[PDB]
Design an enzyme around this catalytic site. Structure first.
Site, PDB file in Angstrom:
ATOM      1  N   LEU A  22       5.417  -3.088  -2.902  1.00 48.62           N
ATOM      2  CA  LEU A  22       4.945  -2.816  -4.248  1.00 48.62           C
ATOM      3  C   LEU A  22       5.711  -3.679  -5.249  1.00 48.62           C
ATOM      4  CD1 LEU A  22       4.734   1.097  -4.056  1.00 48.62           C
ATOM      5  CD2 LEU A  22       2.898  -0.603  -3.707  1.00 48.62           C
ATOM      6  N   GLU A  30       4.266   8.949  -8.106  1.00 40.94           N
ATOM      7  CA  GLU A  30       3.069   8.160  -7.858  1.00 40.94           C
ATOM      8  C   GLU A  30       2.730   8.186  -6.378  1.00 40.94           C
ATOM      9  OE1 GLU A  30       1.289   5.124  -6.849  1.00 40.94           O
ATOM     10  OE2 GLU A  30      -0.261   6.049  -8.105  1.00 40.94           O
TER      11      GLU A  30
HETATM   12  N1  NAP Z   1      -0.453  -0.883  -5.484  1.00 42.66           N
HETATM   13  C1  NAP Z   1      -1.363  -0.442  -4.601  1.00 42.66           C
HETATM   14  O1  NAP Z   1      -2.179   0.464  -4.869  1.00 42.66           O
HETATM   15  C2  NAP Z   1      -1.421  -1.108  -3.253  1.00 42.66           C
HETATM   16  C3  NAP Z   1      -2.376  -0.717  -2.319  1.00 42.66           C
HETATM   17  C4  NAP Z   1      -2.454  -1.361  -1.098  1.00 42.66           C
HETATM   18  C5  NAP Z   1      -1.594  -2.403  -0.827  1.00 42.66           C
HETATM   19  N2  NAP Z   1      -0.695  -2.785  -1.756  1.00 42.66           N
HETATM   20  C6  NAP Z   1       0.119  -4.092  -1.577  1.00 42.66           C
HETATM   21  O2  NAP Z   1      -0.785  -5.170  -1.531  1.00 42.66           O
HETATM   22  C7  NAP Z   1      -0.431  -6.068  -0.452  1.00 42.66           C
HETATM   23  C8  NAP Z   1      -1.462  -5.975   0.654  1.00 42.66           C
HETATM   24  O3  NAP Z   1      -2.779  -6.233   0.120  1.00 42.66           O
HETATM   25  P1  NAP Z   1      -3.482  -7.645   0.337  1.00 42.66           P
HETATM   26  O4  NAP Z   1      -4.622  -7.741  -0.600  1.00 42.66           O
HETATM   27  O5  NAP Z   1      -2.429  -8.683   0.328  1.00 42.66           O
HETATM   28  O6  NAP Z   1      -4.041  -7.512   1.829  1.00 42.66           O
HETATM   29  P2  NAP Z   1      -5.022  -6.543   2.622  1.00 42.66           P
HETATM   30  O7  NAP Z   1      -6.323  -6.486   1.943  1.00 42.66           O
HETATM   31  O8  NAP Z   1      -4.383  -5.187   2.888  1.00 42.66           O
HETATM   32  O9  NAP Z   1      -5.102  -7.274   4.052  1.00 42.66           O
HETATM   33  C9  NAP Z   1      -5.805  -8.535   4.051  1.00 42.66           C
HETATM   34  C10 NAP Z   1      -6.332  -8.819   5.434  1.00 42.66           C
HETATM   35  O10 NAP Z   1      -7.098  -7.686   5.896  1.00 42.66           O
HETATM   36  C11 NAP Z   1      -8.335  -8.122   6.427  1.00 42.66           C
HETATM   37  N3  NAP Z   1      -9.381  -7.761   5.483  1.00 42.66           N
HETATM   38  C12 NAP Z   1      -9.222  -7.424   4.163  1.00 42.66           C
HETATM   39  N4  NAP Z   1     -10.330  -7.062   3.567  1.00 42.66           N
HETATM   40  C13 NAP Z   1     -11.288  -7.160   4.563  1.00 42.66           C
HETATM   41  C14 NAP Z   1     -12.663  -6.869   4.586  1.00 42.66           C
HETATM   42  N5  NAP Z   1     -13.349  -6.430   3.523  1.00 42.66           N
HETATM   43  N6  NAP Z   1     -13.322  -7.042   5.752  1.00 42.66           N
HETATM   44  C15 NAP Z   1     -12.643  -7.485   6.816  1.00 42.66           C
HETATM   45  N7  NAP Z   1     -11.347  -7.793   6.915  1.00 42.66           N
HETATM   46  C16 NAP Z   1     -10.721  -7.601   5.747  1.00 42.66           C
HETATM   47  C17 NAP Z   1      -8.192  -9.622   6.658  1.00 42.66           C
HETATM   48  O11 NAP Z   1      -7.473  -9.818   7.891  1.00 42.66           O
HETATM   49  P3  NAP Z   1      -7.986 -10.778   9.099  1.00 42.66           P
HETATM   50  O12 NAP Z   1      -7.610 -12.191   8.616  1.00 42.66           O
HETATM   51  O13 NAP Z   1      -7.248 -10.343  10.323  1.00 42.66           O
HETATM   52  O14 NAP Z   1      -9.503 -10.574   9.150  1.00 42.66           O
HETATM   53  C18 NAP Z   1      -7.276 -10.020   5.505  1.00 42.66           C
HETATM   54  O15 NAP Z   1      -6.492 -11.175   5.786  1.00 42.66           O
HETATM   55  C19 NAP Z   1       0.984  -5.661  -0.063  1.00 42.66           C
HETATM   56  O16 NAP Z   1       1.927  -6.248  -0.949  1.00 42.66           O
HETATM   57  C20 NAP Z   1       0.953  -4.155  -0.299  1.00 42.66           C
HETATM   58  O17 NAP Z   1       2.260  -3.640  -0.533  1.00 42.66           O
HETATM   59  C21 NAP Z   1      -0.571  -2.150  -2.933  1.00 42.66           C
HETATM   60  C1  HJI Z   2       1.969   4.680  -3.520  1.00 41.19           C
HETATM   61  C2  HJI Z   2       1.239   3.333  -3.716  1.00 41.19           C
HETATM   62  C3  HJI Z   2      -0.234   3.549  -3.955  1.00 41.19           C
HETATM   63  N1  HJI Z   2      -0.595   4.270  -5.032  1.00 41.19           N
HETATM   64  C4  HJI Z   2      -1.887   4.465  -5.255  1.00 41.19           C
HETATM   65  N2  HJI Z   2      -2.245   5.192  -6.336  1.00 41.19           N
HETATM   66  N3  HJI Z   2      -2.875   3.996  -4.484  1.00 41.19           N
HETATM   67  C5  HJI Z   2      -2.528   3.286  -3.421  1.00 41.19           C
HETATM   68  N4  HJI Z   2      -3.499   2.797  -2.624  1.00 41.19           N
HETATM   69  C6  HJI Z   2      -1.180   3.033  -3.116  1.00 41.19           C
HETATM   70  O1  HJI Z   2      -0.884   2.279  -1.985  1.00 41.19           O
HETATM   71  C7  HJI Z   2      -0.807   3.048  -0.745  1.00 41.19           C
HETATM   72  C8  HJI Z   2      -0.834   2.057   0.409  1.00 41.19           C
HETATM   73  C9  HJI Z   2       0.139   0.904   0.163  1.00 41.19           C
HETATM   74  O2  HJI Z   2       1.430   1.466   0.466  1.00 41.19           O
HETATM   75  C10 HJI Z   2       2.614   0.770   0.288  1.00 41.19           C
HETATM   76  C11 HJI Z   2       2.682  -0.609   0.253  1.00 41.19           C
HETATM   77  C12 HJI Z   2       3.909  -1.228   0.072  1.00 41.19           C
HETATM   78  C13 HJI Z   2       5.059  -0.475  -0.077  1.00 41.19           C
HETATM   79  C14 HJI Z   2       4.976   0.906  -0.042  1.00 41.19           C
HETATM   80  C15 HJI Z   2       3.760   1.546   0.133  1.00 41.19           C
HETATM   81  C16 HJI Z   2       3.679   3.051   0.184  1.00 41.19           C
HETATM   82  C17 HJI Z   2       3.608   3.510   1.651  1.00 41.19           C
HETATM   83  C18 HJI Z   2       2.342   4.445   1.848  1.00 41.19           C
HETATM   84  O3  HJI Z   2       1.269   4.010   1.407  1.00 41.19           O
HETATM   85  O4  HJI Z   2       2.612   5.512   2.439  1.00 41.19           O
HETATM   86  C19 HJI Z   2       4.901   4.122   2.079  1.00 41.19           C
HETATM   87  F1  HJI Z   2       5.633   4.614   1.022  1.00 41.19           F
HETATM   88  F2  HJI Z   2       4.689   5.159   2.979  1.00 41.19           F
END
Ligand code: NAP
Ligand code: HJI
Ligand code: CL
Length: 186
Positions: A22, A30
């Protein structure tokens, strides 16, 4: 099988991720909100399904993989089988949603939650039909390398309140944020 939902936390500059983590320091409530919203099923005997991209799956610590109390599904076109700890894997969001109509899941799944990342949100937000977006607005800029797509406000309505969701400003570790819920009936 119940409603289709996205849930995301996003910074003011639209960031959701940075170097596999994150972009902000951990915000306990959150996280608790994310856990409770995606785990709570409206139907006794059923669990919710969480759909996530491959990078999101591996960004979860191995101790918390798969997400407990929910059925987990990973999206990838490269993997030949679900990653260790997962039991479901689909090539696309459309394939995953079609999978929820097969007996192994239709009997078990209540709500479907898309939990990231970027391209999964994009495909989901354009998917036809009823959709809700649970968006945590983190009211600061954070350096990010992964971003949330801007919401098409011609297609979505912003709800002023949603049951069980507090509408006032939250604050942890000096960071203010707010829970929003958007809806479309497309
Ligand atoms: N703040 C939040 O709410 C939140 C939520 C989730 C994650 N995160 C963060 O975001 C990052 C991860 O997200 P990201 O966007 O980098 O990657 P991601 O979408 O989780 O993973 C991307 C990979 O997943 C597959 N993929 C994704 N969408 C697809 C679809 N519609 N159909 C088929 N395959 C699909 C592909 O892999 P292949 O190349 O193997 O096909 C692609 O390379 C991390 O930093 C994580 O911590 C934050
Ligand atoms: C709480 C974040 C969040 N908040 C809302 N509102 N929506 C989402 N989709 C979301 O991301 C959930 C999936 C991505 O998670 C991560 C990715 C990088 C670092 C840490 C985590 C949290 C992990 C978890 O998800 O359990 C771990 F703490 F267990
Ligand atoms: Cl937006």
């Amino acid at each position: 099988v119940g409603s289709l939902n996205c849930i995301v936390a996003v910074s003011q500059n639209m960031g959701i991720g940075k170097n596999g983590d994150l972009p902000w320091p951990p915000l306990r409530n959150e996280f608790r909100y994310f856990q409770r919203m995606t785990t709570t099923s409206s139907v006794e005997g059923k669990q919710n399904l969480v759909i996530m991209g491959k990078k999101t799956w591996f960004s979860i610590p191995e101790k918390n993989r798969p997400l407990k109390g929910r059925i987990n599904l990973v999206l990838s076109r490269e993997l030949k089988e679900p990653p260790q700890g997962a039991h479901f894997l689909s090539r696309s969001l459309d394939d995953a949603l079609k999978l929820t109509e097969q007996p192994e899941l239709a009997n078990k799944v209540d709500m479907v939650w898309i939990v990231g990342g970027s391209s999964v949100y994009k495909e989901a937000m354009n998917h036809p039909g009823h959709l809700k977006l649970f968006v945590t607005r983190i009211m600061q800029d954070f350096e990010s390398d992964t971003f949330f797509p801007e919401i098409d406000l011609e297609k979505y309505k912003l709800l002023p309140e949603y049951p069980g969701v507090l509408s006032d400003v939250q604050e942890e570790k000096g960071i203010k944020y707010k829970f929003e819920v958007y809806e479309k009936n497309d």
